[PDB]
Amino acid sequence: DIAGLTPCSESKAYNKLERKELKVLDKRLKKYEPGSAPYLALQATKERTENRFKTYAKQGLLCGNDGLPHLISDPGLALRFNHAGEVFIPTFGFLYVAGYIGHVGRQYIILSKEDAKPTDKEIILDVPLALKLAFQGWAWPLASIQELRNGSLLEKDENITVSPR
Amino acid sequence: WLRDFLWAQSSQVIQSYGSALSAYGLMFLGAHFVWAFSLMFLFSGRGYWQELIESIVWAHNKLRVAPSIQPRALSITQGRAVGVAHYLLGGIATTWSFFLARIIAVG
Amino acid sequence: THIKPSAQVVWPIVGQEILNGDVGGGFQGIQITSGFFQLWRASGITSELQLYSTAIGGLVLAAACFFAGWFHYHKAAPKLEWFQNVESMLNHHLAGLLGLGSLAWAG
Amino acid sequence: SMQGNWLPGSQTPAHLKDLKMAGNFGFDPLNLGAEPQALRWYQQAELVHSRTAMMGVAGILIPGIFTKLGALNVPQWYEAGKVYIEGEGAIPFGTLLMTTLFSYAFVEGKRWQDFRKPGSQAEPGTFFGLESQFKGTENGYPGGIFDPLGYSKTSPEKLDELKLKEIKNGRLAMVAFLGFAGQYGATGKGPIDNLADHLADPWHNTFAENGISVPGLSAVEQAAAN
Amino acid sequence: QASLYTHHQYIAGFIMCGAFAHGAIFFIRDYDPEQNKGNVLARVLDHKEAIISHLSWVSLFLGFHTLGLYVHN
Amino acid sequence: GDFLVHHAIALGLHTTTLILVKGALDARGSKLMPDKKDFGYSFPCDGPGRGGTCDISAYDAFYLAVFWMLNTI
Amino acid sequence: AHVVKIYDTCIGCTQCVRACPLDVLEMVPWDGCKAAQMASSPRTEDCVGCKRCETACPTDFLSVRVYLGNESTRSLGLAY
Amino acid sequence: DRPLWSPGSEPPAWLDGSLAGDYGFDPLHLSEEPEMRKWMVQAELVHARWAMLGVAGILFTSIAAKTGAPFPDWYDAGKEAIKTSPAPLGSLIFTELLLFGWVETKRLYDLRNPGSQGDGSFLGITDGLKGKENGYPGGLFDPMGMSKNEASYKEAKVKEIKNGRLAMLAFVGFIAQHHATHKSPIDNLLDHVADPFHVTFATNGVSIP
Amino acid sequence: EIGPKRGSLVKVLRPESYWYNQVGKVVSVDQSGIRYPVVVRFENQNYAGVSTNNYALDEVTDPP
Amino acid sequence: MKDFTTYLSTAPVVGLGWAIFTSGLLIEINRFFPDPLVFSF
Ligand code: CLA
Ligand code: CLA
Ligand code: CLA
Ligand code: CLA
Ligand SMILES: CC(/C=C/C=C(C)/C=C/[C@@]12O[C@]1(C)C[C@@H](O)CC2(C)C)=C\C=C\C=C(C)\C=C\C=C(C)\C=C\[C@@]12O[C@]1(C)C[C@@H](O)CC2(C)C
Ligand SMILES: CC1=C(/C=C/C(C)=C/C=C/C(C)=C/C=C/C=C(C)/C=C/C=C(C)/C=C/C2=C(C)CCCC2(C)C)C(C)(C)CCC1
C-alpha cells in the first residue's frame, strides 16, 4: 500500500476489468458450437486471460483507481516492500545480456582488426570464431572489469582521432 | 472535406481497440510514425549527420570498439531516397489502415 | 451476402486471438480485402481441393520459371540479334500471349 | 603442474599448460585466468568461497544427519533462520547482521591488504604484537595462527596434495550448497530427506519428475499417460 | 490560463533556441583560443566529442525506451 | 501516463540540447571540415565533395533544432 | 565575386583545372612540390562556387578552397 | 573404375572411392571439405547403426506380435510401455540424455582429436576407447575382433554401410506405410505376399487419391 | 635520408588532416627539399575517398 | 560447398540466422509461458 495504491488482490476496479473482459470474451462464445475449433481457441483465450488475472494478483502487484497494475521503480522501496520483481532483478537481467552483446562485439572487433585487410570481416563474417566468442561471453562483466583495470579496455587519446575545433 | 471525411470517418479506427480491427489502428499509428520519421531524412542534410557520426566514432574509439568499416552518413541522393521511401510507406499505410478499418467496421 | 471473406489466420501466440474476428460461417480470421473469393466464384471453383490443385500447379510453374531463368542465362543465353527481333516479339506477344490467353480464358 | 583434464581431448589454455596450481584440470574455456594477477585474485576468491562452503555444507549435513538419527531436534536449514528469529533468547536480526558485517569487513580488509601487498599485515607493532605471524605464505594460504596444529610446515609434496584435496572438497561443497538451495527450491524439503527419497525410491523421486526443475515435463508425462 | 501557458512556453523554447544559436555564433565569430588557454571554455572545446556522444547516448536511450513502452502499452 | 509523458518531455529537451550543443561545439571546426570558422556562421554547404556536406553549418544545426523545439513544446 | 584561394599543400596533379568548367584555375610553375606546378586563379571573378575543384582535390585538407559570398551576374550562373 | 550410383556418370573429386560404400553419389557437393567429410562420414555411420538397431527391434517386436506374444505395434510402443515401466517418463529421457551426453561427447572429442580418449583418463583404458579410423572405433567395441584382417575389415565396412543405407530406407518405408495402412510391417509383408496382384501401395485408399 | 625510414609507421599530428592522431605507413620521402616531402599511406580512406597524403617533417612522429 | 559456405557466412548468418533464432526463441517463451509482468520466479 505505497503511493496510495491498493493491492491487485483487493482491488474492486481490477475485478471489474476482469469480469468485463470475461463478458466480452463470452459474447463471442455464443456464436460458435461448443465442439468447434474457434470455440476451442476462444476457450483457450479465456483460460489464458483467467490465468493472467490470477497470476498478476497475489504476486506483489498494486493498482490504483484504474484497475491496471502499477510498477514500483525506486529500489529500496522495492526491497522492504515485496516489489523487487517488478524492475529490480530484470534491470540486471537486461544489463547482463546487453553487456554480453557489447562484449562479444568488442571481442570480434579486436580479433578482426588484427587480421590482414580487416574491412572484409564485417561483411564476410566468420561463424566458428563468432560462435566461440558467443559461448565465451557469459563472464562478460569479469572480463570487462579486468580489461578496464589493465588499461586495454580504453585507448590513449594520443591515438584517437580528435576534432580540430 | 476535413470534418466530414477525415473526422466523420476514422472514428472506427481509433475505437478499434479490443476488437477485430485493432491491428488496423496499430497499422495506422505505425504509419503515422513512419511518415513522420521520414521528414528527418528530408529536411536535414549530410554534414550535420556526418559530424554526429564523427562524434559517435570518437566515442567508440575511446574504448576500442571502432568498426573496421568506417561509419559514414548516408549520401544526399541516398538520404533523399530514404526520406521519400519512408514518406510514401507511411502515407500509403496510413490511407490503407484508415480506408480498410472504415470500410470493414461500417460497410 | 452474410459471411465476410477471410483467407488469413493468425496464431494464438500473443494477443492475436482478438485479430481472428468472427467473419461468420463458424470461422475466425482476418477479413480479407483482395476480393479473391469473388474471383474464385467467377471462375468456377467449388471446393478447396481445386484451390489446392491450383496452388500446387502455381508452385510447379514458379519452379519451372526459375529453372527457365537459370537456363536462359547460365546455360543457353540468347544473343543480341535474338532480342532485337522486335517484329517477332510483337507478333508472338500479340497473337500468342494476349490472344491465346484471351481465347483460353473464353473457352 | 598439469594434473588430469576436465575434458579429455579439449584444447587446454596456454596459461594452464605449465602452471603450478592446486586442482588444475584445464577448466577455463572462457580464458578468465589468462592474466596472472587476475588468476591470483580468482584463486583467492575460489579459496574463500570454497572454505565458507565447507562450513555451510557441514552445517547443512551434520545437524541434518544427527536429526535423521534422532539425536537432536535441530530443524532443517531453510526454516532454522525463522526458528532462531522466533526464539525467546534471541539477538535481533539487525544486530546479528551488523555484527557479522563488521567482523567480516575487518577480517576481509586484513585479507585484502594481504592480497594487494604480500606480507603487509606483518607491520611491527600494529596488532597487539601478534601480527608478526600474520605474514602470508601464499595467495589464500596465510599460515600463522591459521595453522595452530602445525600441519603445513612439512615437505611440499603432502602440502600441495593437501591443497589439491582442499580445493577438491571445496568445489564439491560449492556444488553441494548450490544443490541444497536448488533442492529446497524445487522439492521444499531437506537434503537428507531428499537422499532418503532417492535411496528408497529412485525412479519416482528425481529432478525430472518435479515440475519446477524442468517446466512442461509434467504436461508431457500427462499427455503420454492419456 | 491555457493560452498564457502555451504562449510563454513556446516563447521560452524559441528563446532557448536563440540562446544556443548565438552561443554557436560566439564560438565561430569572436572566440580566441590563445586568449583563454586551458580554461573551462578551451577544455570544454577539447572534449566536445565526449559531450556530444553522451548527449546522443542519453537521447537515444530515452527515445528508444520511451517509444518502446508507448508502443508496448 | 504523467510519468511517461514527462519522460517524453525529457527526451525532447535532451535531443534539442544534443543538437544545439553539437552545432555550437562544431561551429568553428569539425573532422569533415576543419575550416568552418572561415566560412561564416550561416553558409549553405561545402559542395558534393567529401561525401556531401549539406547542412554542415551551425546555422543549419539551429534550423534542425527548431523542429525538435517545436515538437518538445 | 567569390574568393578562390590555393594553399601550399598543392602537389600539381593539374586535375583541379580540368574539373572547373569556367576556366577560373590555371597551372603555374612552382618549386614547393615534386611536379613543380601550382594552381592559380586569375579569373576568380568568373567563378560561381560549384566546388568541383574541391571535389577533384586529393590533398587532405583541400589545397584549393572556394569561399561563397558577394554574388554577381556571372557568379550566379545567369544567362539572363 | 568402380560401380557408380549412375552408370556412365562422373564421380565427384572428393569421392575417390577410399570410403566404404563410395558410389560417388553427391549432387549437392556436401562433405567437400575434409573436416566436413569426416563429420559427414561420422554422421552417416551413427545414423546407420541407429537405423539398423531400430529396424531390427521393430522387426523383432512385429514378428513376436505376429506369433502371438503380447507385443505392441512399432508405433505407440512407448505409450503402452510407460504404463508398465517402473521408470516414469521424464526420468527415463533425462537418464538417457545424461548417458548419451557422456558417450557422444567422448566420441565427438575422439572425432576431433583421434586417440584422445585412449589416454587412460576414463578408468585407465588406453588401447580401448581409442579410435581406429574416421567413424570406426576399436578395442572394447571390437570384442571378437574380426576387423584385424584388412581385407575382411574392408568387406565388413562395405557390408555395414550397405545394410545401414538399406536400414535408412527400411525406417522410411516403415513410417510411410504405417501412415498408409495403420498396420504392422509384418502385417504389410504378409498382405503383400498373400495378394501381390491387388494389395500394394496403390490400393490402400490413402496416398493415391 | 632527412625523414623517417621508408615503410615505418608514423603518427600524424596535423590538426586539419583527416588522420590526426592516426598511424600511417611511409611510402616515400622526397629529397629535393619540397614543402611536404613525406608521403604516407593510410589503411582507412577519407571522405574524399583517397588513402594517401603528404605531410611535413614536423607533422610526423613515431607512435608509441 | 566451400564457395557456398563462404556466401552463407555473409549477411544472412547475422541478418537471418540470428533473427530467426532470437525471434523463435522469444516466441516460444511467450507461448509456453503466459504473459508475465513481475519477476517472481
Ligand atoms: C516523429 C518523427 C520522428 C522520430 C521518431 C525521430 C526519431 C529520432 N530522431 Mg529525429 N527528426 C524528425 C522527426 C523524427 N525523429 C524531424 C521532422 C526532424 C527535423 C529534420 C528531426 C531532426 C533530427 C535531428 C537533427 C536529430 C534527430 C535525432 C533523432 C533520434 C533521437 C534519439 C531518440 O529519441 O532515440 C531513438 C528514438 C526513436 C524513436 C527510435 C526509432 C527506432 C525504433 C526503435 C524502430 C527501429 C526499427 C524497428 C526495430 C523495426 C525494424 C525494421 C524496420 C527498420 C524496417 C531518433 C532516431 C537525433 C539523432 O539521431 O542523434 C542521436 C538528431 O541529432 N532527429
Ligand atoms: C557490439 C558493438 C558495439 C558496441 C560495443 C557499441 C558501444 C557503444 N556505442 Mg555503438 N553502435 C553499434 C555497435 C556497437 N556500439 C552499431 C552496429 C551501431 C549502428 C546502428 C551503433 C550506433 C551507435 C550510436 C548512434 C551511438 C552508439 C553509442 C554507443 C555507446 C553506448 C552504449 C550503447 O548501448 O549504445 C547504444 C548502441 C546502439 C543503439 C547500437 C545497437 C546496434 C547493435 C546492438 C549492435 C550489433 C553488433 C553485433 C551484435 C556485434 C557482432 C557480434 C560478433 C560476435 C559477430 C557505446 C560506446 C552512443 C554513444 O556515443 O554513447 C557514448 C550513440 O549515440 N552507437
Ligand atoms: C507465342 C509465344 C510467346 C509467348 C506466349 C510469350 C510470353 C511471354 N514472354 Mg515472350 N517472346 C517470344 C514469344 C512468346 N513469349 C518470342 C518469339 C521472343 C523473341 C523475339 C520473345 C521475347 C521475350 C522477351 C525478351 C521477354 C519476353 C517475356 C515474356 C513474358 C511476359 C510477361 C507477361 O506478360 O506475363 C505473362 C506470364 C505468364 C503467362 C506466366 C506463365 C509463363 C509461361 C511459363 C511461359 C510460357 C510461354 C512460352 C513461350 C512457352 C514456350 C517455352 C518453351 C521453351 C518451354 C510472357 C510469359 C518477358 C520475360 O522474360 O518473361 C518470361 C521478356 O522480358 N518475351
Ligand atoms: C533579443 C534577442 C536577440 C538578439 C539581440 C538577436 C540579434 C541577432 N541575431 Mg539572433 N536569434 C534570436 C534572438 C535574438 N537575435 C532568437 C530568439 C532566435 C531563434 C529564432 C535567433 C536566431 C538567430 C540565428 C540563427 C542567427 C541570428 C542572427 C542574429 C543577428 C541578426 C539577425 C537579424 O536582425 O536579422 C534580421 C532578420 C529578419 C528581418 C528576418 C525576420 C524573419 C523572422 C525571423 C521569421 C518570422 C516568421 C514569420 C515571417 C513572422 C511573421 C508571421 C506572419 C503571419 C505575419 C543579430 C546579431 C544571425 C547572425 O548573427 O548572422 C550570422 C543568425 O545567423 N539569430
Ligand atoms: C532416410 C534418411 C536420410 C536420407 C537422406 C538422403 C536420401 C539424402 C540425400 C543426399 O545427401 C545425399 C546422399 C548426397 C547429397 O549430395 C544430396 C542429397 C539429396 C542431400 C534417414 C533416416 C534415418 C533413420 C533413422 C536414424 C532411424 C532410426 C530409428 C530408431 C532409432 C528407432 C527407434 C524406435 O523408437 C521407434 C521410432 C519406435 C519404437 O516403437 C521402436 C524404437 C526402436 C524404440
Ligand atoms: C533552490 C531549490 C532547489 C535547487 C535548485 C537548483 C540547484 C537548480 C539549478 C538549476 C540549474 C543549474 C539550471 C541550469 C540551466 C542551464 C541552462 C538553461 C543553460 C543554457 C546554456 C546555453 C544556452 C549556452 C550557451 C552558450 C553556448 C552554446 C556556447 C558558449 C556561449 C554560451 C554560454 C552563451 C531544490 C531542487 C534542491 C529544491 C527546491 C528549491
Ligand SMILES: CC1=C(C/C=C(\C)CCC[C@H](C)CCC[C@H](C)CCCC(C)C)C(=O)c2ccccc2C1=O
Ligand atoms: C538520420 C539521417 C542520417 C543518419 C542515418 C544513417 C547513417 C543510416 C542508419 C541505418 C541503420 C544503421 C540501419 C539499421 C537500423 C537498426 C540498427 C535496426 C534495428 C533492428 C532490430 C531488430 C534491432 C543520414 O545519414 C542522412 C543523410 C542525408 C540526409 C538525411 C540523413 C538523415 O536524416
Ligand code: SF4
Ligand atoms: S586539385 Fe588541389 S592538390 Fe590537385 S593540382 Fe589542384 S590545388 Fe593542387
Ligand code: SF4
Ligand atoms: S568552385 Fe567551380 S568554377 Fe570556381 S574555381 Fe572551383 S571548380 Fe572552378
